[PDB]
Every structure is written in structure tokens, then in C-alpha cells.
């Protein structure tokens, strides 16, 4: 252990296991072992001292980093079967000091207990207040949240690129989000969410969204679709040519328009293209001509964003065309918070119809209160309260899972200092009649994500269309 700590002969990756009762000592140097760093505890004191933290605050232009911390014998990499013989503590300031005797032979201490979570699960604010199924659901849905997936998307030409108009970093954030680079590439917009029953259109899991906010760019996004075409020479006199076919030069012809194409059969960007419009004009010389042009997907109604032409591996002409279409959130789109609270948009009400506070605040999203009890997302309510506190305070809330220094009572006392009800409730006036709603509605900013699942891509209708060649039955898909 001393050699591994000093990294003289044994690298920190190698693990040492002492099975005391079975008298075996096993040392593993093979690849594939899973391991995590852990602080070393000597007697009841950490080996992390104040000087290490002081140097790490100075990490910039000091040439002192995590590697030097490992080389000081302070942290240690421990695998699963070396974790067998170790005794860990949650936090030093709780489990190392003397108390009613439980244990005193602590050999290691965890850096922070929130490190047990993965990438997608670390974005959940207050994940310890949630039912574990809801945490799993949010971890699954976070991959589907729309946003700026990459900064150089303008140069990438890939199918199904979803980019959100105005991503926002969450009001209530976790300290792990900094290391996920989530601040620079957020997926979702903080939204004033009032958990209330308003018109019954948010019932079950559905939500009610502010139409006026939607008109202002709220949860508006772009859908980029890319089309690739390959020129090729397969037959002797058979070849692929990029060109604009005329009315009668080819044998096969579809009633779709071809006038939008340029001289090479490629539409320049800035051309609005609807369903059945031709993207690339390509013909086949049959051993007169055969038209194999590429058309739009049905009812996309987008605008050609970027057109790129190059040479493939073989040296033939290769064309990629990216078509963009702006999709305003409809009442079929799928929206989910950071707690597994998912649902579609029941209906969109304008600012006039939505309920309003004494200050004129109208919720951007209304979710049915019936979701919370059975689905067990208390962290959703706590995040809403913390966001309401932080928007007034001007700071960004800290929702690290295991803080012990952020109580719901403390957040309530913080909120009560800003002239609001300490529990987050707020009196709402009916949008239609103007009468006070007898119950006081729990309203506050909550981080919500627009999911890739949208109604325009899912709606389908069939009436005597194409049939399979073999079964003579309707096609699949």
C-alpha cells in the first residue's frame, strides 16, 4: 500500500486484496477492472489536509493537479473486490469525529456521496427526494431532452439534429453539472410552472402551456434532416448523373415539381420545400433514362438550410443536403421536468386565459397536481420552491443530493423574506372570470425539457396506399 501510495514500483491502477479469514492475498494488474478514487484515512483523520486544498485552489499556473494529489498518497483508486476489505465513511465531518461508538477503524472516506450517480442522473435536482423509478425515468428521458447537442452543429450534416432556440441553465442546479458541461450546452428552459387543476386539459400526465409564451419562442426548436446522394457507375453504359430532368427525357417520372432544382439537380439553400418536393435530381441511363430523384418526407414543409457537394471514397460526386424546419410546440409535443414528470401538452392558452398572480405572472406550464402523490416526486416540488427562491435572490440554487445544509424549512424561510408565502403557494386569479381561485396555487419556476417525441413525427393516416409485393398487404411503417 505504501508503494502504491507513493507510486514507486506499483501504479495506482493496480489493486491489492487481503482476504484475512481465507488467508489469500490477491494482486490484480489486468485491464477492465472498475475502480474509483477514495480518500485515505489514517486513524480517524483524513490525509487530505488544508495545504492540499490551498494548492488545488491555486491549480491554475501552479502545475499542481489531481495527479500530484494521487502521488502524495492522499487519494487512492479502489476497485470492487478491494472495496470488500475497505471501510468507508460518508463524510469526514460526520463519521470521523468521536461519538457514540459505532466504528473507529475507518480506512477510507468518500470524496462526495453524490459521485455514485451517472451522467444523466446527476442532472436531477434533489434526486434523494424522488422515488427511485422516477429518478430512472428522468435519467432515461434526459437523453431525449432537446437542446444544443454540440456547438459546431452548423457544420455537421447528420439526420435528425434537434436544436432548441433558447436553452437555459437550470435555476436549481447540482454541483455535478459543472463537470458535465451542462451549463454550456443546456437542454431545456426554466419555466414558471403552476401545479394546479385549471380546465381539465392537464389531467392524467398532460400539461397546459402558455400560448403567449410559446409565441415568444418558449420551447421553440429546429429540426435538421440530412439527405445524402451518391453518383455511381455500375453498368457498362449505366451511370448516375446529377442533373435537372425535363418533362420527357426520362421514362420514370413523378408528378412532383422539378423546377426548384438548379442546373446540376441540387436545390440551393434558402428554398422552401414542402412534401413531395425533389431534393436531388438524379437520372439512370438504362441499357431512354430512368429518374431516381430524392423527394421530401411527407409533410415536412421545411427550408433547405445547407447544401454540400463533394467526392466520396471512389471519387464520384457526393451530395449532402440538410433541410431545416422550425417546429413551434403544439399540443402533441412531449414535455418532461427533471424528475420523471412527463406528459404531452393538453392545450395552449394565451396570456389572457391563463391564471395570473397579483403581479401579473402567468404560468408558462400548468401540470396536474394528481401526478405528484402517486408518482412520488417530492424533489419536483422542492426544486420548484428552490427556483422561486433563487430567481428572487439572484443566486443559482444548489440541489446537490446529499447536502444536509439545505432544508425545506430553510428554503421556506428564505422565500418568506421576499414577500411570498413561505410554502411556495400563491393566490391565483381565474383567467376567464377574474375571480380569485379559492385554493392557493403552488407556482414557481421549474426546469422543463422538451423531448424529441413530437406529434408531427408520429401522426399517420392510411387509405389504400402502397401494398407489399409478396403478401399484397399494406406496407409496414
Amino acid at each position: 500500500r505504501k508503494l502504491r501510495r507513493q507510486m514507486d514500483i506499483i501504479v495506482s491502477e493496480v489493486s491489492m486484496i487481503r482476504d484475512i479469514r481465507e488467508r489469500e492475498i490477491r494482486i490484480y494488474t489486468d485491464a477492465g477492472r472498475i475502480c474509483r478514487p477514495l480518500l485515505i484515512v489514517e486513524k480517524q483523520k483524513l490525509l487530505l489536509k488544508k495545504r492540499h486544498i490551498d494548492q488545488l485552489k491555486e491549480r491554475e499556473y501552479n502545475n499542481y493537479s489531481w495527479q500530484d494529489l494521487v502521488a502524495s498518497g492522499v487519494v487512492e483508486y479502489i476497485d470492487t473486490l478491494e472495496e470488500e476489505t475497505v471501510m468507508l465513511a460518508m463524510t469526514p465531518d460526520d463519521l470521523q469525529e468521536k461519538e457514540v461508538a459505532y466504528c473507529s477503524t475507518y480506512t477510507h472516506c468518500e470524496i462526495h456521496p453524490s459521485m455514485i450517480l451517472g451522467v444523466c442522473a446527476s442532472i436531477i435536482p434533489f434526486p434523494d427526494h424522488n422515488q427511485s423509478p422516477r429518478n430512472t425515468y428522468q435519467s432515461a428521458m434526459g437523453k431525449q431532452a432537446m437542446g444544443v447537442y454540440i456547438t459546431n452543429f452548423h457544420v455537421r450534416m447528420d439526420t435528425l439534429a434537434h436544436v432548441l432556440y433558447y436553452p437555459q441553465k437550470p435555476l436549481v442546479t447540482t454541483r455535478s453539472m459543472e463537470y458535465l458541461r451542462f451549463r454550456e450546452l443546456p437542454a431545456g428552459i426554466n419555466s414558471i410552472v403552476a401545479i394546479a387543476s385549471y380546465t381539465g386539459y392537464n389531467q392524467e400526465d398532460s400539461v397546459i402551456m402558455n400560448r403567449s409564451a410559446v409565441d415568444r419562442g418558449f420551447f421553440r426548436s429546429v429540426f435538421y434532416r440530412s439527405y445524402k446522394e451518391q453518383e455511381s457507375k455500375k453498368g457498362f453504359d449505366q451511370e448516375e448523373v446529377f442533373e435537372k430532368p425535363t418533362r420527357e427525357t426520362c421514362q420514370g417520372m413523378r408528378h412532383a415539381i422539378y423546377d426548384k432544382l438548379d442546373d446540376d439537380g441540387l436545390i440551393a439553400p434558402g428554398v422552401r420545400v414542402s412534401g413531395d418536393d425533389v431534393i436531388i435530381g438524379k437520372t439512370v441511363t438504362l441499357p431512354t433514362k430512368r429518374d431516381c430523384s430524392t423527394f421530401l418526407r411527407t409533410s415536412e414543409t421545411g427550408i433547405v438550410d445547407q447544401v454540400m457537394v463533394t467526392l466520396n471514397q471512389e471519387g464520384y460526386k457526393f451530395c449532402k443536403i440538410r433541410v431545416r424546419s422550425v417546429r413551434i410546440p403544439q399540443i402533441g409535443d412531449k414535455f418532461a421536468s427533471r424528475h420523471g414528470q412527463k406528459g404531452t401538452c393538453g392545450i395552449q392558452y394565451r396570456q389572457e386565459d391563463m391564471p395570473f398572480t397579483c403581479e401579473g405572472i402567468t404560468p408558462d406550464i400548468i401540470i396536474n397536481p394528481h401526478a405528484i402523490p402517486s408518482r412520488m416526486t417530492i424533489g419536483h416540488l422542492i426544486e420548484c420552491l428552490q427556483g422561486k427562491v433563487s430567481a428572487n435572490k439572484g443566486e443559482i440554487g444548489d440541489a446537490t443530493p446529499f447536502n444536509d445544509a439545505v432544508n425545506v424549512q430553510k428554503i421556506s424561510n428564505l422565500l418568506s423574506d421576499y414577500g411570498y408565502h413561505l410554502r411556495g403557494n400563491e393566490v391565483l386569479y381565474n383567467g376567464f372570470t377574474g375571480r380569485k381561485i379559492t385554493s392557493q396555487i403552488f407556482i414557481g419556476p421549474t426546469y422543463y425539457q422538451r423531448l424529441k417525441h413530437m406529434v408531427d413525427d408520429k401522426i399517420h393516416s392510411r387509405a389504400r396506399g402502397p401494398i407489399q409485393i409478396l403478401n399484397r398487404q399494406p406496407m409496414e411503417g
Binding site: 454540440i150 456547438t151 459546431n152 457544420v155 458541461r181 454550456e184 450546452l185
Partner: protein, 49 residues
């Protein structure tokens, strides 16, 4: 020459290794791109452990 081995992006032998944010932007590559994936026929492939 016995063949060509696909190169995981941003590894030691990748062309993007050791380049700063400005360098990556000059070559139209996202600085935030974590790398660690392969590019085969233009498709980004990631090996699952």
C-alpha cells in the same frame, strides 16, 4: 503497409490531440466534444464496454 486502423477521436494518435479551444474551432470542431468515438464512413461509432 499492412492496413489502416481506425483512430478514436481525441486520442493520443488523433489529429485533434493537444489542440486548444481556438485550434479546434479553427478546424470546425467543437471544443466541448468529448471525443472517444470512431468515425467510419462518416458515421460516429462508439464502442460499448
Amino acid at each position: 503497409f499492412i492496413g489502416k486502423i481506425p483512430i478514436m477521436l481525441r486520442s493520443t494518435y488523433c489529429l485533434l490531440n493537444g489542440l486548444t479551444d481556438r485550434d479546434l474551432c479553427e478546424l470546425n470542431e467543437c471544443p466541448l466534444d468529448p471525443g472517444g468515438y470512431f468515425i467510419i464512413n462518416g458515421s460516429e461509432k462508439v464502442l460499448i464496454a
